[PDB]
Amino acid sequence: SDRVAQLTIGNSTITTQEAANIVIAYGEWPEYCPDTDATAVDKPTRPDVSVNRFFTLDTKSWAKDSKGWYWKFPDVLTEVGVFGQNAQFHYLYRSGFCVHVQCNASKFHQGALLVAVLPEYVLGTIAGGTGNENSHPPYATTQPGQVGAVLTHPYVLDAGIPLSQLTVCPHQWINLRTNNCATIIVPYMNTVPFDSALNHCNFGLLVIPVVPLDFNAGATSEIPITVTIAPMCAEFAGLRQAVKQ
Amino acid sequence: QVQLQQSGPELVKPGASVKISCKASGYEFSRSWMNWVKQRPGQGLEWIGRIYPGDGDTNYNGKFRDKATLTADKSSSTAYMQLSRLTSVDSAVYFCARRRGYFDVWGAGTTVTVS
Amino acid sequence: DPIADMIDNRSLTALQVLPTAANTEASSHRLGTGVVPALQAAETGASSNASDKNLIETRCVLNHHSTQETAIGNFFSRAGLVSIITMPNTDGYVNWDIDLMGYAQLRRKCELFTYMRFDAEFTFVVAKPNGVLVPQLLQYMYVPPGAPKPTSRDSFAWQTATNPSVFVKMTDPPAQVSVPFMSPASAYQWFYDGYPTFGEHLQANDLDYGQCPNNMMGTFSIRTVGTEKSPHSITLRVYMRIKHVRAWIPRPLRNQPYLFKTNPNYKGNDIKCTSTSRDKITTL
Amino acid sequence: GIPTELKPGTNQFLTTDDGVSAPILPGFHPTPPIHIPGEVHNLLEICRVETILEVNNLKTNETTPMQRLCFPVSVQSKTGELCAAFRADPGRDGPWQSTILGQLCRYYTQWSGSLEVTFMFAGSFMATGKMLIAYTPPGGNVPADRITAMLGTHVIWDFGLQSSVTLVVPWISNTHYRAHARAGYFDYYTTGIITIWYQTNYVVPIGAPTTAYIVALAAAQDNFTMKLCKDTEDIEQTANIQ
Amino acid sequence: SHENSNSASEGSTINYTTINYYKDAYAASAGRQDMSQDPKKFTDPVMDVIHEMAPPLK
Amino acid sequence: IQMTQSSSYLSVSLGGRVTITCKASDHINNWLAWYQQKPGNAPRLLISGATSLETGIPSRFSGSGSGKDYTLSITSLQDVGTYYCQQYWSTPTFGGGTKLE
Ligand SMILES: CCCCCCCCCCCCC/C=C/[C@H](O)[C@H](N)CO
């Protein structure tokens, strides 16, 4: 009764049979911007069913010595679907998300992931090793796209903050003996009510195997990981011609 | 300084019994299993069984059941093994080991012949 | 009525006031099946809601330990060093751009939260480089972003007809002043993931990653008042106190030492572990 | 005018003393606030969120520091051996430094209240077992065997559908508060020793791995308070920044 | 009738009693802080509420 | 579980770096011991747990084994005697033996 769940929105539908609860990040649901917190003086657009649906991304592979991956939002949906076209024509956007991460294995495998959400995730380099020169990360690393890069040093999260106290952010676990999916619902978090979509990435999601995957030899060694997302209450404003980046 | 001391050799009639003894000294006699290993003079080793002198439970090999009886005196620090209905196959040498694991310290060995 | 489609969740928590810590009431043994307060499931992303009275047998106590020392108004209401300014520079005036992330004591406290809206109080302790004091007249002018910054000791920018400025002597008590919240946004932020401008981001222009323009507050320029060269060296120290604090979205703290004033870069060859190591796992 | 006098304490600058000060800008009005989710009002609801404890802090894990979060269990050959042991005070340098409770307690001098330690099993579905987790009040060292350590406050935990268990470390002290424990005179404020043991073995069938790992989490209870804010020891500045 | 309320804490204040001598409200003292705290939105944010006596995976 | 120890009667020469192999049948999980025996004497356990040495034994003996096939290697000969192997996973069974020249 607690384990089974079904999430339907738009024309898509996700079923699951081995799940924990849904985590609502900071106890608050996504919503539209009220008149008191608004600042623009034009009517925004709401496309109800062409942008609020489950978009699925590429599929990774979990080996016995994996490091951990990360994605940036809303960088992943800038080139996918009607959300990818409204974010290029308009100037401002405002939305909340709903992330679902699937990964399954049999009853003879073991391991544990950590699915977390870290708002305003600013990356840093290793300063050339010796710490003498400051190197800044390239454009294909700060905003990787819908593929998502990897963590080259995951103990310090590539930013100098430790992994041990990452659970102060909203998070769930993928324990391979208990469940196989994690769901987080996150509202819009920013200092300004509307913002641009091609420059600012207001939160980033990262998946890290804490306890490494192990199995007995002869079993299935291809254990994949899939991420599906869905924009919740998207708005757009400030129409112009199309700007890619 | 752990010491395991056995008895002397025996000459026994086929169809009779014999009682080999193994005496431990230098450590706590309880809280340690005691093993008995058989080695027929030409070839390798065979495991007979073990005894726990704290209470007295014993595990045997499959073949050596109803051939050997393991007993242990907790006060005298001595573990006995009695063989019954001896035939000419049972001419061998018997050892006394002590780990429950991988046989830390071994006894000297008692030669038993039957004719 | 002509279209039934176009005619069209709750608040999860509530805030309550707690002056002191919670009391403990007595309990006893409970031999029975069905209920298990000791077995949680950490996969749900929630902490354990078990207490002491459901695990062991407790006595009743009534504690009056207050919880006001840990409020964020009292955690932050302490002054701290933000800059030192020295003019041995060699001709009078010194233009110091405002940047308060240069010292590791106050930077680590303010970077516990992502957004923070507050009110600063500043004070300026000025002396000779060996801690001596001579009579000398000075002027500290605050230049907002866009205003003409001074370029000499006797420029026209020191007429301060609209810019605020403080005249103080060296042998006086230090000069306190109060500065409001002056950002265009609704809060300051110490972490801005993203580029400030539009356009193609090349390899040369990778410097702009992580620079929020809502935190630029102009410069802060000092001088000696006279038009001839003063024979004294002067070092100045600025201390900042935070008041009327509101903070949002906590985040992990830092364990690696800082390297630069603008980016979270760290030394990649010496990754210092968080805890101190020991010999065995069984022998503490 | 009005006849006054100046007492001692004049023209001093005390850093932790609030008072009215002159403003720079008359007639200013700040930007109106926006509802941003996740506002804190007190540092006590960050000390209730549970974070990972580095129990396996050996000197051989300094090169590959991701090993320091999970300590192993396996199929044992003798009955009643112990798996881990560590002290139960958040101020001392040890396993508690990696937690958000161990970093926020650093800023204060004295603390009070009870803690909690949550263990989570990360083995396969077909492996079973039972383990004993005990807490020993001060006065002694690490206990020598299982028959000695079970006289403290303990709990017996078995692996099933619910994978987690919670050991509370109850507030047993002579004083109302506790300064941070340390080698020397400040061992008077020590808290105790948490050791886990083997109740039964770790039984696994044919075709499943024979070594599983355990993650340990830690937080604080409702009656946890702190006072006497001070400076921290975990940040250093040898040379200047930038 | 009052004097120019421009503070960084207007909507959700900390208390009422703070001293002030100028006409600008951001120049006032700190005062004593309130003891309100909402620990639930960081500790147990979940869709279905869980009880401590029930099994959390039922 | 039956231990093979398939090779006996080896041929060595005084520093010849011989290795001795044995294999189990049903996945012993690195729980072996290697048991040198001299003629007319009790055996001595050279190694425990298939990797670990006891005290007093010179460090020219070293053992390993990956999945099922376990090895024992000597480097500087003279050390001539009969070598057995013994698993302790279900019940103690021994190997055949290995005589050297
Ligand atoms: C004569 C009075 C001079 C007053 C000079 C100080 C006024 C400016 C106060 C700015 C308040 C802090 C704003 C942000 C500062 C940090 O350095 C930025 N976040 C840099 O990251």
Side-chain angles (χ1 to χ4, degrees):
Chain A
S1 199
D2 198 314
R3 309 185 71 88
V4 294
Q6 162 163 339
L7 322 177
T8 173
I9 173 172
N11 44 20
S12 78
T13 296
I14 289 184
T15 67
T16 181
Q17 303 197 31
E18 217 177 314
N21 268 304
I22 318 292
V23 165
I24 306 179
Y26 305 124
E28 199 141 1
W29 280 85
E31 63 184 278
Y32 288 130
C33 175
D35 289 345
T36 307
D37 289 345
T39 172
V41 296
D42 46 50
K43 195 163 301 186
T45 176
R46 293 178 179 83
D48 181 65
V49 188
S50 64
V51 307
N52 301 147
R53 52 169 290 149
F54 270 113
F55 295 96
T56 179
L57 312 174
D58 277 338
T59 313
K60 302 305 178 183
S61 291
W62 193 0
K64 286 185 176 185
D65 48 349
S66 277
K67 286 296 189 56
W69 310 264
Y70 67 94
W71 293 265
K72 294 290 204 60
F73 290 101
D75 187 28
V76 287
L77 297 173
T78 295
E79 296 88 5
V80 182
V82 163
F83 193 94
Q85 293 305 119
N86 275 300
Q88 298 178 7
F89 277 107
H90 295 88
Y91 173 51
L92 308 169
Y93 94 107
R94 162 188 179 90
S95 44
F97 284 84
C98 167
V99 183
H100 196 85
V101 177
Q102 303 110 12
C103 164
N104 54 345
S106 58
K107 300 186 187 296
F108 284 176
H109 292 72
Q110 65 187 30
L113 289 177
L114 171 65
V115 179
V117 162
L118 177 52
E120 311 274 354
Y121 178 39
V122 185
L123 292 157
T125 64
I126 61 174
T130 43
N132 278 129
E133 66 270 15
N134 42 353
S135 51
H136 312 89
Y139 184 59
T141 314
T142 64
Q143 284 177 13
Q146 68 104 17
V147 196
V150 295
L151 296 169
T152 182
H153 263 102
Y155 182 57
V156 292
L157 282 174
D158 289 331
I161 51 178
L163 193 138
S164 312
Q165 53 192 357
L166 181 53
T167 72
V168 69
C169 296
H171 71 291
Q172 277 220 21
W173 293 78
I174 302 295
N175 201 6
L176 277 192
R177 78 196 305 269
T178 305
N179 51 342
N180 52 13
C181 57
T183 308
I184 317 170
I185 296 177
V186 48
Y188 186 73
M189 297 164 313
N190 207 2
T191 55
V192 299
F194 283 80
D195 208 288
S196 163
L198 313 172
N199 299 317
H200 192 40
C201 317
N202 52 5
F203 76 102
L205 178 136
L206 48 89
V207 173
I208 290 160
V210 174
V211 174
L213 171 84
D214 205 52
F215 44 84
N216 228 26
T220 318
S221 88
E222 301 272 335
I223 305 300
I225 298 169
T226 322
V227 178
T228 83
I229 50 182
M232 270 287 200
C233 278
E235 291 179 328
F236 304 99
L239 185 52
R240 57 158 204 269
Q241 81 270 353
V243 180
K244 286 305 290 293
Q245 52 101 29
Chain B
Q1 201 265 326
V2 188
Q3 265 295 98
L4 260 67
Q5 177 91 8
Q6 301 193 9
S7 47
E10 300 274 46
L11 176 48
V12 60
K13 198 82 59 190
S17 296
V18 61
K19 196 185 203 63
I20 307 167
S21 89
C22 172
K23 183 161 191 307
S25 76
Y27 76 118
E28 179 191 10
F29 181 59
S30 297
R31 293 189 180 92
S32 310
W33 296 71
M34 191 80 49
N35 291 281
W36 292 87
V37 188
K38 180 182 168 216
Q39 183 185 36
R40 290 199 34 184
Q43 61 269 18
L45 304 164
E46 295 146 282
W47 182 71
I48 301 157
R50 54 190 166 205
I51 181 71
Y52 192 37
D55 48 354
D57 47 346
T58 177
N59 301 354
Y60 296 104
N61 204 354
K63 323 203 316 296
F64 294 89
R65 195 177 305 276
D66 317 315
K67 187 69 64 52
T69 317
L70 269 76
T71 299
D73 185 310
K74 204 197 320 183
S75 66
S76 267
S77 64
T78 307
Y80 317 99
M81 175 170 73
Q82 182 197 263
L83 283 80
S84 56
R85 293 182 183 174
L86 292 157
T87 185
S88 46
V89 176
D90 295 70
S91 288
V93 53
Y94 297 88
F95 292 104
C96 189
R98 196 260 316 158
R99 190 51 210 265
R100 167 67 163 89
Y102 42 83
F103 307 151
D104 264 349
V105 56
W106 290 67
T110 301
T111 314
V112 172
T113 183
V114 53
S115 51
Chain C
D1 176 70
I3 293 101
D5 190 13
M6 316 166 54
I7 63 177
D8 289 305
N9 50 73
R10 63 178 174 87
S11 312
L12 190 143
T13 174
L15 174 65
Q16 60 175 351
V17 55
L18 302 170
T20 77
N23 300 338
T24 295
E25 70 156 19
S27 82
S28 82
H29 61 264
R30 193 173 55 218
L31 273 300
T33 83
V35 307
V36 296
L39 291 163
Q40 271 71 228
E43 289 89 2
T44 56
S47 313
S48 72
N49 47 0
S51 164
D52 305 357
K53 67 188 298 297
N54 306 322
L55 266 295
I56 65 172
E57 312 185 273
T58 61
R59 65 163 302 173
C60 176
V61 301
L62 299 174
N63 57 342
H64 307 95
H65 304 313
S66 197
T67 73
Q68 213 195 338
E69 188 90 20
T70 73
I72 62 178
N74 303 334
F75 179 66
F76 274 109
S77 157
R78 323 179 99 75
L81 181 58
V82 300
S83 88
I84 64 174
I85 297 174
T86 318
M87 34 181 193
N89 291 96
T90 61
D91 64 301
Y93 81 112
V94 159
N95 277 312
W96 179 68
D97 196 301
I98 286 184
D99 190 18
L100 311 180
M101 309 278 105
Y103 288 89
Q105 217 83 36
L106 192 67
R107 186 171 169 182
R108 197 174 176 267
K109 282 176 63 198
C110 284
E111 284 191 349
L112 172 57
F113 307 106
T114 307
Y115 312 126
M116 197 174 312
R117 156 169 196 142
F118 56 89
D119 239 306
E121 154 142 11
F122 288 85
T123 166
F124 313 97
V125 176
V126 49
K128 277 183 73 75
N130 55 347
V132 175
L133 291 157
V134 296
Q136 177 78 46
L137 191 71
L138 281 79
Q139 176 181 11
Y140 316 139
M141 194 172 66
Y142 168 57
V143 173
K149 45 175 57 180
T151 183
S152 88
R153 197 177 56 243
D154 43 308
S155 177
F156 82 105
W158 300 107
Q159 301 179 11
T160 175
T162 37
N163 287 348
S165 83
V166 188
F167 286 84
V168 74
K169 312 180 276 193
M170 189 186 297
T171 49
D172 262 0
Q176 260 184 359
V177 81
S178 184
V179 180
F181 174 74
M182 44 179 62
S183 177
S186 159
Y188 299 118
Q189 43 174 349
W190 325 111
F191 295 95
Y192 178 72
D193 173 74
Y195 294 89
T197 51
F198 277 87
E200 182 69 29
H201 315 289
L202 281 180
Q203 200 79 108
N205 292 318
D206 271 346
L207 165 62
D208 314 278
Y209 173 61
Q211 311 285 317
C212 192
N214 294 132
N215 301 143
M216 321 287 179
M217 291 310 166
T219 75
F220 172 77
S221 41
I222 73 173
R223 84 173 167 139
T224 74
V225 168
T227 60
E228 293 177 350
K229 181 91 194 51
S230 184
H232 295 301
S233 289
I234 281 173
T235 78
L236 193 138
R237 292 173 159 86
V238 191
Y239 288 89
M240 171 189 106
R241 206 184 96 227
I242 302 182
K243 29 193 240 185
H244 307 96
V245 196
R246 296 182 78 182
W248 292 273
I249 314 186
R251 73 164 49 237
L253 287 165
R254 190 171 168 103
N255 53 2
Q256 303 289 136
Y258 289 99
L259 280 197
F260 309 96
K261 273 201 290 187
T262 43
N263 44 10
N265 279 328
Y266 60 98
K267 179 182 166 188
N269 265 348
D270 193 352
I271 303 294
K272 279 191 288 297
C273 316
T274 317
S275 46
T276 74
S277 44
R278 57 180 162 161
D279 299 317
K280 316 289 300 179
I281 193 185
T282 68
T283 80
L284 53 88
Chain D
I2 314 178
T4 77
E5 272 195 5
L6 304 182
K7 301 284 109 177
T10 293
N11 310 139
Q12 61 170 5
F13 171 54
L14 176 56
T15 84
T16 63
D17 156 43
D18 74 340
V20 188
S21 42
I24 45 171
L25 293 156
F28 198 77
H29 275 272
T31 309
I34 304 304
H35 171 70
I36 312 177
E39 188 181 11
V40 310
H41 298 274
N42 208 325
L43 286 191
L44 280 190
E45 67 264 20
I46 321 180
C47 298
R48 292 154 160 257
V49 194
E50 48 194 11
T51 55
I52 310 181
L53 197 66
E54 283 184 3
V55 182
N56 196 17
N57 46 357
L58 311 182
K59 282 178 184 296
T60 81
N61 290 342
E62 295 265 354
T63 44
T64 168
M66 285 291 283
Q67 302 287 327
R68 295 164 84 87
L69 310 172
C70 45
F71 60 97
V73 302
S74 49
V75 183
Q76 287 297 125
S77 165
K78 296 185 291 293
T79 73
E81 307 282 70
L82 79 162
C83 196
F86 55 96
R87 293 208 189 86
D89 46 352
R92 206 191 274 231
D93 313 345
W96 288 80
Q97 293 198 335
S98 46
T99 48
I100 198 53
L101 182 62
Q103 297 289 330
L104 283 181
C105 168
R106 297 317 249 295
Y107 279 107
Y108 291 90
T109 318
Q110 303 156 354
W111 62 279
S112 174
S114 41
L115 319 169
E116 64 195 1
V117 175
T118 306
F119 296 93
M120 172 184 164
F121 186 55
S124 86
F125 181 73
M126 294 272 172
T128 75
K130 284 174 180 290
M131 289 185 90
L132 173 63
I133 312 159
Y135 161 66
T136 295
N141 299 58
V142 182
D145 49 355
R146 190 181 69 192
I147 208 72
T148 302
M150 40 76 51
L151 281 83
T153 299
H154 63 101
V155 66
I156 293 166
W157 164 48
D158 60 320
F159 320 130
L161 258 65
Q162 275 89 14
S163 53
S164 310
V165 81
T166 298
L167 177 65
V168 292
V169 185
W171 179 244
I172 307 176
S173 177
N174 43 4
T175 65
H176 282 266
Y177 280 91
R178 269 184 173 153
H180 286 165
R182 210 168 152 203
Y185 294 112
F186 281 160
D187 262 332
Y188 166 73
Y189 300 111
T190 183
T191 311
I193 300 172
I194 299 181
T195 73
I196 89 171
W197 300 82
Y198 271 97
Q199 190 74 261
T200 64
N201 215 358
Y202 172 77
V203 175
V204 78
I206 305 176
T210 75
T211 301
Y213 288 172
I214 290 185
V215 194
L217 306 168
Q221 283 289 279
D222 200 331
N223 47 346
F224 190 86
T225 73
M226 288 175 300
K227 67 179 178 66
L228 194 43
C229 192
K230 65 170 183 58
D231 221 350
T232 179
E233 310 89 297
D234 292 12
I235 195 64
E236 276 64 50
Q237 184 165 342
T238 60
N240 51 1
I241 298 181
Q242 172 74 260
Chain E
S1 178
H2 284 96
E3 285 85 7
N4 219 357
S5 90
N6 44 6
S7 181
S9 175
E10 330 165 319
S12 287
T13 43
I14 57 188
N15 220 311
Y16 186 67
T17 69
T18 58
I19 63 184
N20 191 15
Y21 304 125
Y22 304 96
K23 64 169 179 171
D24 300 332
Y26 62 92
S29 89
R32 52 173 295 179
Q33 271 72 230
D34 55 351
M35 279 77 67
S36 71
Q37 43 175 342
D38 202 332
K40 284 286 300 309
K41 70 183 160 197
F42 294 94
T43 297
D44 293 352
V46 285
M47 184 69 72
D48 298 7
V49 304
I50 54 182
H51 300 280
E52 45 264 61
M53 305 273 195
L57 276 192
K58 183 63 193 304
Chain F
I1 302 193
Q2 298 294 322
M3 306 292 296
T4 61
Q5 205 173 2
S6 86
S7 165
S8 65
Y9 284 142
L10 287 165
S11 54
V12 299
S13 81
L14 272 292
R17 293 182 183 174
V18 70
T19 198
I20 319 172
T21 80
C22 170
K23 64 164 304 274
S25 71
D26 289 345
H27 267 291
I28 74 185
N29 290 313
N30 297 114
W31 279 14
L32 195 68
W34 264 114
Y35 287 129
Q36 182 182 4
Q37 184 182 33
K38 268 161 156 74
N41 273 260
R44 145 157 69 159
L45 177 63
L46 309 152
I47 279 176
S48 183
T51 56
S52 311
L53 275 299
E54 309 294 300
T55 77
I57 286 92
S59 63
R60 70 174 64 95
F61 303 96
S62 46
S64 67
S66 47
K68 268 176 174 166
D69 316 329
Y70 293 83
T71 66
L72 162 69
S73 45
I74 310 108
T75 76
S76 314
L77 295 174
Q78 262 311 357
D79 303 347
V80 167
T82 304
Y83 289 80
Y84 302 95
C85 81
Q86 186 261 330
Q87 56 96 5
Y88 42 98
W89 177 256
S90 43
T91 42
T93 82
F94 283 87
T98 304
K99 287 214 60 61
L100 303 184
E101 338 285 2

